[PDB]
Design a protein around this motif. Sequence first.
Motif, PDB file in Angstrom:
ATOM      1  N   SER A   8       1.055  -0.810  -0.505  1.00  0.00           N
ATOM      2  CA  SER A   8       0.088  -0.054   0.225  1.00  0.00           C
ATOM      3  C   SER A   8       0.893   1.030   0.069  1.00  0.00           C
ATOM      4  CB  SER A   8      -0.742  -0.092   0.844  1.00  0.00           C
ATOM      5  OG  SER A   8      -1.620   1.015   1.449  1.00  0.00           O
ATOM      6  N   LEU A   9       0.952   1.786  -0.933  1.00  0.00           N
ATOM      7  CA  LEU A   9       1.054   3.529  -0.926  1.00  0.00           C
ATOM      8  C   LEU A   9       0.364   4.370  -0.506  1.00  0.00           C
ATOM      9  CD1 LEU A   9       3.193   5.824  -1.278  1.00  0.00           C
ATOM     10  CD2 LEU A   9       2.623   5.790  -3.450  1.00  0.00           C
ATOM     11  N   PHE A  10       0.699   5.067   0.659  1.00  0.00           N
ATOM     12  CA  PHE A  10       0.140   6.333   1.651  1.00  0.00           C
ATOM     13  C   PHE A  10       0.766   7.122   1.631  1.00  0.00           C
ATOM     14  CE2 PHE A  10       0.212   4.431   5.373  1.00  0.00           C
ATOM     15  CZ  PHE A  10       0.800   3.201   5.321  1.00  0.00           C
ATOM     16  N   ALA A  11       0.590   8.011   2.495  1.00  0.00           N
ATOM     17  CA  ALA A  11       0.913   9.176   3.012  1.00  0.00           C
ATOM     18  C   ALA A  11       1.475   8.706   4.489  1.00  0.00           C
ATOM     19  CB  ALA A  11       0.456  10.784   2.920  1.00  0.00           C
ATOM     20  N   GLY A  12       1.947   7.831   5.221  1.00  0.00           N
ATOM     21  CA  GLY A  12       2.196   7.501   6.381  1.00  0.00           C
ATOM     22  C   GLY A  12       3.347   6.513   6.211  1.00  0.00           C
ATOM     23  N   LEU A  13       3.490   6.022   7.981  1.00  0.00           N
ATOM     24  CA  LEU A  13       4.232   5.134   7.765  1.00  0.00           C
ATOM     25  C   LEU A  13       3.337   3.854   8.082  1.00  0.00           C
ATOM     26  CD1 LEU A  13       6.351   6.338  10.763  1.00  0.00           C
ATOM     27  CD2 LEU A  13       6.821   6.146   8.289  1.00  0.00           C
ATOM     28  N   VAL A  14       3.734   2.485   7.811  1.00  0.00           N
ATOM     29  CA  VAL A  14       3.032   1.165   8.414  1.00  0.00           C
ATOM     30  C   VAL A  14       3.552   1.287   9.304  1.00  0.00           C
ATOM     31  CG1 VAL A  14       3.385  -0.869   7.938  1.00  0.00           C
ATOM     32  CG2 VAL A  14       4.052   0.396   6.052  1.00  0.00           C
ATOM     33  N   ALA A  45       0.356   5.227   9.831  1.00  0.00           N
ATOM     34  CA  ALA A  45      -0.043   5.650  10.942  1.00  0.00           C
ATOM     35  C   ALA A  45       0.584   7.418  10.553  1.00  0.00           C
ATOM     36  CB  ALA A  45       1.755   5.838  11.660  1.00  0.00           C
ATOM     37  N   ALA A  46       0.112   8.393  10.449  1.00  0.00           N
ATOM     38  CA  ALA A  46      -0.105   9.450   9.014  1.00  0.00           C
ATOM     39  C   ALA A  46      -0.228  10.395   9.830  1.00  0.00           C
ATOM     40  CB  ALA A  46      -1.556   9.456   8.008  1.00  0.00           C
ATOM     41  N   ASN A  47      -0.397  10.777  11.764  1.00  0.00           N
ATOM     42  CA  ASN A  47       0.018  11.685  11.990  1.00  0.00           C
ATOM     43  C   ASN A  47       0.245  11.880  12.633  1.00  0.00           C
ATOM     44  OD1 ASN A  47      -0.712  14.293  13.096  1.00  0.00           O
ATOM     45  ND2 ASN A  47      -3.278  14.069  14.074  1.00  0.00           N
ATOM     46  N   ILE A  48       1.255  11.324  13.733  1.00  0.00           N
ATOM     47  CA  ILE A  48       2.507  10.581  14.649  1.00  0.00           C
ATOM     48  C   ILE A  48       2.197  11.493  16.242  1.00  0.00           C
ATOM     49  CG2 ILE A  48       3.859   9.326  14.896  1.00  0.00           C
ATOM     50  CD1 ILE A  48       4.238   8.643  12.707  1.00  0.00           C
ATOM     51  N   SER A  49       0.506  12.256  16.790  1.00  0.00           N
ATOM     52  CA  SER A  49       0.735  12.546  17.468  1.00  0.00           C
ATOM     53  C   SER A  49      -0.073  11.855  18.335  1.00  0.00           C
ATOM     54  CB  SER A  49       0.515  13.928  17.214  1.00  0.00           C
ATOM     55  OG  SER A  49       0.481  15.045  18.599  1.00  0.00           O
ATOM     56  N   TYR A  50      -0.106  10.899  19.180  1.00  0.00           N
ATOM     57  CA  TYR A  50      -0.497   9.930  19.906  1.00  0.00           C
ATOM     58  C   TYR A  50      -1.246  10.308  21.704  1.00  0.00           C
ATOM     59  CZ  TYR A  50       0.565   7.469  15.628  1.00  0.00           C
ATOM     60  OH  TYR A  50       0.467   7.238  13.936  1.00  0.00           O
ATOM     61  N   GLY A  51      -1.848  10.164  21.626  1.00  0.00           N
ATOM     62  CA  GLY A  51      -2.360  10.098  23.505  1.00  0.00           C
ATOM     63  C   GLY A  51      -2.590  11.583  23.267  1.00  0.00           C
ATOM     64  N   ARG A  52      -2.397  12.120  24.962  1.00  0.00           N
ATOM     65  CA  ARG A  52      -2.577  11.158  26.076  1.00  0.00           C
ATOM     66  C   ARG A  52      -4.350  10.697  26.334  1.00  0.00           C
ATOM     67  NH1 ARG A  52      -0.159  14.708  31.296  1.00  0.00           N
ATOM     68  NH2 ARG A  52      -0.184  12.282  32.843  1.00  0.00           N
ATOM     69  N   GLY A  53      -3.984   9.497  27.292  1.00  0.00           N
ATOM     70  CA  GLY A  53      -4.947   8.701  27.679  1.00  0.00           C
ATOM     71  C   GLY A  53      -4.236   8.127  29.229  1.00  0.00           C
ATOM     72  N   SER A  54      -4.824   6.794  29.793  1.00  0.00           N
ATOM     73  CA  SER A  54      -4.738   7.076  31.012  1.00  0.00           C
ATOM     74  C   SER A  54      -5.937   5.048  31.066  1.00  0.00           C
ATOM     75  CB  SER A  54      -5.172   7.601  32.045  1.00  0.00           C
ATOM     76  OG  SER A  54      -5.561   8.471  32.156  1.00  0.00           O
ATOM     77  N   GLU A  65      -8.749   5.594  21.189  1.00  0.00           N
ATOM     78  CA  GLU A  65      -8.196   7.364  21.431  1.00  0.00           C
ATOM     79  C   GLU A  65      -7.097   7.282  21.510  1.00  0.00           C
ATOM     80  OE1 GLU A  65      -9.779   5.992  25.498  1.00  0.00           O
ATOM     81  OE2 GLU A  65     -11.632   4.867  24.462  1.00  0.00           O
ATOM     82  N   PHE A  66      -5.429   6.241  21.694  1.00  0.00           N
ATOM     83  CA  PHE A  66      -4.491   7.544  21.142  1.00  0.00           C
ATOM     84  C   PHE A  66      -4.101   7.390  20.236  1.00  0.00           C
ATOM     85  CE2 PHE A  66      -0.205   4.931  20.280  1.00  0.00           C
ATOM     86  CZ  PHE A  66       0.638   6.311  21.410  1.00  0.00           C
ATOM     87  N   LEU A  67      -4.696   6.738  18.970  1.00  0.00           N
ATOM     88  CA  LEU A  67      -4.248   6.667  17.679  1.00  0.00           C
ATOM     89  C   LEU A  67      -4.557   7.992  17.215  1.00  0.00           C
ATOM     90  CD1 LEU A  67      -4.035   3.028  16.739  1.00  0.00           C
ATOM     91  CD2 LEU A  67      -2.140   4.410  17.237  1.00  0.00           C
ATOM     92  N   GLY A  68      -6.123   8.022  17.654  1.00  0.00           N
ATOM     93  CA  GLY A  68      -6.862   9.308  17.043  1.00  0.00           C
ATOM     94  C   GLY A  68      -7.550   9.388  15.805  1.00  0.00           C
ATOM     95  N   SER A  69      -6.808   9.860  14.939  1.00  0.00           N
ATOM     96  CA  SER A  69      -7.134  10.247  13.138  1.00  0.00           C
ATOM     97  C   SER A  69      -6.901   9.491  12.464  1.00  0.00           C
ATOM     98  CB  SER A  69      -6.709  11.732  12.884  1.00  0.00           C
ATOM     99  OG  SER A  69      -5.301  11.917  12.578  1.00  0.00           O
ATOM    100  N   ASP A  70      -5.932   8.319  12.885  1.00  0.00           N
ATOM    101  CA  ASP A  70      -5.140   6.658  12.338  1.00  0.00           C
ATOM    102  C   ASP A  70      -6.373   5.492  12.709  1.00  0.00           C
ATOM    103  OD1 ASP A  70      -2.938   8.930  11.056  1.00  0.00           O
ATOM    104  OD2 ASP A  70      -1.772   8.074  12.714  1.00  0.00           O
ATOM    105  N   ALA A  71      -6.614   5.849  14.180  1.00  0.00           N
ATOM    106  CA  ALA A  71      -7.653   4.660  14.310  1.00  0.00           C
ATOM    107  C   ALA A  71      -8.621   3.630  13.314  1.00  0.00           C
ATOM    108  CB  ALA A  71      -8.384   5.181  15.398  1.00  0.00           C
TER     109      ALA A  71
END
Length: 187
Positions: A8-14, A45-54, A65-71
């Motif tokens: 797969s080619l996408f603008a992100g990390l695998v 993984a297209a937006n590598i800014s995850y969390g915070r959570g508990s 919830e952690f992965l947010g927009s990549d989930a």
Amino acid sequence: QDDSTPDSLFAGLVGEYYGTNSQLNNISDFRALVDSKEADATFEAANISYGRGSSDVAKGTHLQEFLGSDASTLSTDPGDNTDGGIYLQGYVYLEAGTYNFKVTADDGYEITINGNPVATVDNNQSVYTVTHASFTISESGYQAIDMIWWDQGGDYVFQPTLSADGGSTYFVLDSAILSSTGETPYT
Ligand SMILES: OC[C@H]1O[C@@H](O)[C@@H](O)[C@@H](O)[C@@H]1O
Ligand SMILES: [Ca+2]
Ligand SMILES: [Ca+2]
Ligand SMILES: [Ca+2]
Ligand SMILES: [Ca+2]
Ligand SMILES: [Ca+2]
Ligand SMILES: [Ca+2]
Ligand SMILES: [Ca+2]
Ligand SMILES: [Ca+2]
Ligand SMILES: [Ca+2]
């Protein structure tokens, strides 16, 4: 391309997620988990800014919830585990020059570029931000990158920001510069 399967080619990390009921204490522990089995879930993984959570990343819907927009790119919803983490790999477009990471995390992590570690926390920790030492990129283009991060339990966060201007400004690694294969992504 290294085998007979189209990638797969996408603008992100695998992205790969792995969970465990054993304790993760350090990078070696998490890498051994990755080595031990197939991923519990994959994602882009297209937006590598995850969390915070508990209350543990490996429980319930905390990973989502952690992965947010990549989930929305998760291959499955993993079952419960006590401990878990992510392994990301692909390419990042960097012009030649000097860079440094500044990473906020709970627990630890390691980022490598072109095979060389450039940001390491080899232990567990409550949320903490480290400004890492600078590194050079020799030739402009897509650089190989991988990351690992884990949560041993409790709170969780992962935001590895990068500076191109000596630590005056930092950016998140996202679809502006990431590529899953090293080809240019158009969406
Ligand atoms: O001891 C509990 C705390 O341990 C720290 O190292 C972090 O993993 C926290 O997220 C956790 O809540
Ligand atoms: Ca392939
Ligand atoms: Ca594996
Ligand atoms: Ca779940
Ligand atoms: Ca988010
Ligand atoms: Ca999404
Ligand atoms: Ca644990
Ligand atoms: Ca934790
Ligand atoms: Ca610069
Ligand atoms: Ca600043």
